């Protein structure tokens, strides 16, 4: 039994899905529905860039959501069975929720565009930072972050695997926290091309505004279980899912535990339904008997079907 996992911001690249689109017309059909909802040509953006445009997060998010949904749609169209469960990393949670039938596709597309805008404006450029902490246990990182905060905000924001954790917050505190992490034994503290300090308390006022938009959108019951980032819970009540998306934005993404949870439910393989191979690469680092592979190239897609 397999699950579908859906990647988040960082997995996009200019040219993504080009080959899948050439094998499967539904890809561009899907991107055209999205483009109609956004008022610009999403496909052309993903194929032509430039990268700097594709990496603006109010454009990244709809781009990635649409990419993942298109891949899902290819799977379904070609007779693929439903996954036992789904989970999506950050933005990817929206993708899962679309594919599980909870949010209308066009609704989600507009939604994550607004999400992106709320996030971007949350904090002035140059006030926030993210760092990748490499080779330190979760708990030592939390302590390091607590000690370093000193009335500013910094905390773990992605638990991606054992020994791979992202922190974020105010620039200065993220610096303090990196250093404390090194002092505690971390192999690396690598600064990321971030700005937007997502998934810490700085996103609150963005989350409040997201809540207002989410309430405008019909949420349906999921047709397959979706394990959420915030609680590692499969909610089925629309308003509970809604609430989980709000809380998701200013709380850490529990990817490690979500992947452990899926394995604990009997899942044996994760298909990454999205561009890139980020989540695929995490998988074995979380549970070394779990396998994973990506479904963004036609051959892989065929081999899996």
UniProtKB/Swiss-Prot annotation:
Enzyme class: transferase
Pathway membership, UniProt: Lipid metabolism; fatty acid biosynthesis
SUPFAM superfamilies in the record: FabD/lysophospholipase-like, Probable ACP-binding domain of malonyl-CoA ACP transacylase
SMART domains: PKS_AT
Active-site residue list: 90, 199
Catalytic activity field: holo-[ACP] + malonyl-CoA = malonyl-[ACP] + CoA
Pfam families with a match to the protein in the record: Acyl_transf_1
GO molecular-function term, one example from the UniProt record: [acyl-carrier-protein] S-malonyltransferase activity
Any single biological process term in GO: fatty acid biosynthetic process
Gene Ontology CC: one annotated term: cytosol
UniProt entry keywords in alphabetical sequence: Acyltransferase, Fatty acid biosynthesis, Fatty acid metabolism, Lipid biosynthesis, Lipid metabolism, Transferase
EC number: 2.3.1.39
NCBIfam families referenced in this protein's UniProt entry, alphabetically: fabD
Protein family per UniProt: Belongs to the FabD family.
Protein name: Malonyl CoA-acyl carrier protein transacylase
Organism: Escherichia coli (strain K12)
Gene: fabD
């Amino acid at each position: 039994q397999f699950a579908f996992v859906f990647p988040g911001q960082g997995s996009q690249t200019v040219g993504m899905l080009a080959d899948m689109a050439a094998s499967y017309p539904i890809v561009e059909e899907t991107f055209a529905e999205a483009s109609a909802a956004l008022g610009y040509d999403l496909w052309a953006l993903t194929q032509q860039g430039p990268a700097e445009e594709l990496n603006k997060t109010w454009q990244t998010q709809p781009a990635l959501l649409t990419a993942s949904v298109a891949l899902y749609r290819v799977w379904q169209q070609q007779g693929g069975k439903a996954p036992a469960m789904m989970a999506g990393h950050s933005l990817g949670e929206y993708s899962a929720l679309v594919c599980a039938g909870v949010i209308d596709f066009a609704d989600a597309v507009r939604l994550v565009e607004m999400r992106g805008k709320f996030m971007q404006e949350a904090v002035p450029e140059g006030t926030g930072a993210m760092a990748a902490i490499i080779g330190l246990d979760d708990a030592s990182i939390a302590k390091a972050c607590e000690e370093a905060a000193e009335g500013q905000v910094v905390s773990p924001v992605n638990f991606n695997s054992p020994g791979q954790v992202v922190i974020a917050g105010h620039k200065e505190a993220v610096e303090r926290a990196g250093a404390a992490c090194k002092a505690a034994g971390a192999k690396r503290a690598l600064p990321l091309p971030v700005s937007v300090p997502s998934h810490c308390a700085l996103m609150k006022p963005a989350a409040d505004k997201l809540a207002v938009e989410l309430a405008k959108i019909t949420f349906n019951a999921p047709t397959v279980p979706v394990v959420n980032n915030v609680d590692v819970k499969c909610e089925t009540n629309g308003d509970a899912i809604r609430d989980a998306l709000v809380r998701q934005l200013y709380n850490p993404v529990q990817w490690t535990k979500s992947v452990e949870y899926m394995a604990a439910q009997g899942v044996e393989h994760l298909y990454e339904v999205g561009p890139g191979k980020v989540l695929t690469g995490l998988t074995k680092r979380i549970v070394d008997t779990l396998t994973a592979s990506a479904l963004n190239e036609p051959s892989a897609m065929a081999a899996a079907l």
